[PDB]
């Protein structure tokens, strides 16, 4: 029996990690080569610290993995996760995710199946999509909304304004906003959208952890009459116990989790039914392997899935999410931001929504790869992401 297994083993021959910045964001791809000549591609994108992820892959995951059998995705995932002893966290998990996704790509290519078919097939025809409408005026928002409705979108995440104020003398360098102004403007945004559009479309909004708990609860009560499809990240991950007070008195639909990279962040959240949609970034939790398990975990508790799909993610990562989304029965919706020309050249054949739906790739594997030569035209470039130094008017840091 060991001959047969070995007759079919698939030895890893190389591991590489490429950072590319075709457009606005540093994107990170892991490429796994095997003795069988089948090559896999994975997303490892942690856009704020890409060199750290590349160091992790090149200096540590590569010598660990060369020579091991790519077939055994589950063992290699369990092994990689604990390999540095200390574990979890964004740098390690993204590096592992790149490998994990590439291993799944390889297995699906070898099975001659689209990735979602390897999982067990479709439980939906396609996944609904929401887009981002952001403007500093209501009329700018209306213009973007009108355009999206025309394209067939039924769900749109709307944000008014961008985030004067009474600071102290000589305020510390940072990115300032005012929580009360943000709340006022957002409630007014919803009120205006409902007045103009009624129930034409589902309105989403991302609070992006900008509030204190007392403000979050007030906001939930102020916004609930407008029936948002979901309110995202109404609290930071360290304060989700405060969601119980919201759940006890508001019917507002809640989404949370794009920041998660440790299972302790989500277990009590889900067990206690504190959110309606889990928003994890697949590469932050360690790839396809844990995403499947988390999807199953959520299903048991009646929690639905809306994986984080920001511009700072490869089209490979986006394709993987669509595979997960057409497969997992509790997947709800896929976030999408239009790809630009440079990105499309580096990652050919990336799907775009058609009439409000994203369709899974139907060729073998993930269905999207990286053009290595094209990636070279757009190397990594340092960006400070100053918005993460978010400060309140008194000069103190708030979670960004």
Which region among 59-67, 84-92, 203-211, 221-229 touches Mg ion (by CB under 5 A)?
A: 203-211
Q: Is 400 in the site for its own copies (CB under 8 A)?
A: yes
- Residue 11: contacted member of its own copies, Cl ion, Mg ion, none (CB under 5 to 8 Å, by partner type): none
Which region among 49-57, 159-167, 199-207, 288-296 touches Mg ion (by CB under 5 A)?
A: 199-207
Q: Do residues 338 and 353 lie in contact, with contact meaning Cβ atoms separated by under 8 Å? A: no
| Nearest residue to 42 (alpha-carbon basis) of 316, 249, 278 | 316
Q: Do residues 286 and 74 lie in contact, with contact meaning Cβ atoms separated by under 8 Å? A: no
- Residue 344: contacted member of Mg ion, its own copies, Cl ion, none (CB under 5 to 8 Å, by partner type): none
Q: Of 273 and 385, which CB lies nearer to Cl ion in the complex structure?
A: 385
Q: Is 312 in the site for Mg ion (CB under 5 A)?
A: no
Contact with Mg ion (CB under 5 A): which of 105, 206, 265, 312?
206
232 in a labelled binding site: yes
Footprint (CB under 8 A) of its own copies, residues 135-164: 152, 154
Footprint (CB under 5 A) of Mg ion, residues 253-272: 258
Could you tell me the two tokens for 385? 């992401």
264 in a labelled binding site: no
State phi, psi for 276 to the nearest 5 degrees.
-100, -25
Q: How far is the CB of 191 from Cl ion (least distance, A)?
A: 29
Q: Is 284 in the site for its own copies (CB under 8 A)?
A: yes
Measured CA distances, 240 to 132, 212, 393 (Å): 25, 11, 24
User: Which residue's Cβ lies closest to Cl ion?
Assistant: 89
Which residues fall within 8 angstroms of residue 170, CB to CB, at 6 or more apart? none
Q: Please tell me whether residue 42 adopts helix, strand or coil conformation.
A: strand
Q: How far is the CB of 139 from Mg ion (least distance, A)?
A: 24
| Nearest residue to 262 (alpha-carbon basis) of 281, 288, 285, 240 | 285
Binding site for Cl ion (CB under 5 A): 89-92, 166-167, 383-385
150 in a labelled binding site: no
Alpha carbon distance 290, 257 (integer Å): 14
Q: How many other C-beta atoms can be found within 10 angstroms of the C-beta atom of residue 247?
A: 17
Q: Is 302 in the site for its own copies (CB under 8 A)?
A: yes
Q: Is 369 in the site for Mg ion (CB under 5 A)?
A: no
Could you tell me the two tokens for 42? 């994975």
Q: Please tell me whether residue 11 adopts helix, strand or coil conformation.
A: strand
Contact with its own copies (CB under 8 A): which of 196, 238, 340, 352?
238
Alpha carbon distance 338, 317 (integer Å): 14
Annotated binding site for Mg(2+): 206, 232, 258
Q: What are the binding residues for D-arabinonate?
A: 208, 258, 279, 308, 335
């Amino acid at each position: 029996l060991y001959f047969q297994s070995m007759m079919n083993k698939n030895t890893i021959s190389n591991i590489e990690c490429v950072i590319t910045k075709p457009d606005r964001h540093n994107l990170i791809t892991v490429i796994v080569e095997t003795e069988s000549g089948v090559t896999g591609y994975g997303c490892a994108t942690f856009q704020q610290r890409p060199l750290a992820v590349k160091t992790m892959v090149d200096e540590y995951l590569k010598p660990l993995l060369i020579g091991k059998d790519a077939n055994n995705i589950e063992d290699l995932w369990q092994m990689m996760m604990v390999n540095a002893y200390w574990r979890n966290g964004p740098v390690i998990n993204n590096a592992i995710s790149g490998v994990d996704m590439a291993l799944w790509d390889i297995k699906a290519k070898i099975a001659n199946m689209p990735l979602h078919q390897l999982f067990g097939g479709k439980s939906r025809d396609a996944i609904q999509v929401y887009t981002h409408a952001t403007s500093d005026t209501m009329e700018g928002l209306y213009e973007q909304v009108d355009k999206y409705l025309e394209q067939g979108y039924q769900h749109i995440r709307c944000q008014l304004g961008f985030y004067n104020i009474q600071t102290a003398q000589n305020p510390t360098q940072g990115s300032y906003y005012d929580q009360d102004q943000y709340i006022e403007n957002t409630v007014e945004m919803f009120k205006n959208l409902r007045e103009k559009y009624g129930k034409q479309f589902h309105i989403l909004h991302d609070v992006h952890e900008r509030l204190f708990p007392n403000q979050a609860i007030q906001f939930a009560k102020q916004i609930e009459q407008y029936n948002p499809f979901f309110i995202e990240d109404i609290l930071p991950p360290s304060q989700t116990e405060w969601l119980d007070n919201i759940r006890n008195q508001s019917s507002v639909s809640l989404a949370l989790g794009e920041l998660f990279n440790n299972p302790e962040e989500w277990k009590a959240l889900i067990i206690n039914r504190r959110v309606d949609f889990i928003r994890c970034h697949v590469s932050q939790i360690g790839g396809i392997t844990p995403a499947l398990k988390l999807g199953h975990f959520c299903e048991s508790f009646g929690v639905r899935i809306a994986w984080h799909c920001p511009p700072d993610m490869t089209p490979i990562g986006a394709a993987v999410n669509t595979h997960l989304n057409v497969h997992l029965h509790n997947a709800a919706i896929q976030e999408h931001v239009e790809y630009k020309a440079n990105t499309q050249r580096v990652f050919p054949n990336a799907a775009e929504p058609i009439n409000g739906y994203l369709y899974a790739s139907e060729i073998a594997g993930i269905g999207v790869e990286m053009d290595r030569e094209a990636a070279q035209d757009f190397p990594v470039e340092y960006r400070p992401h100053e918005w993460t130094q978010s400060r309140l008017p008194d000069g103190s840091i708030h979670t960004p």
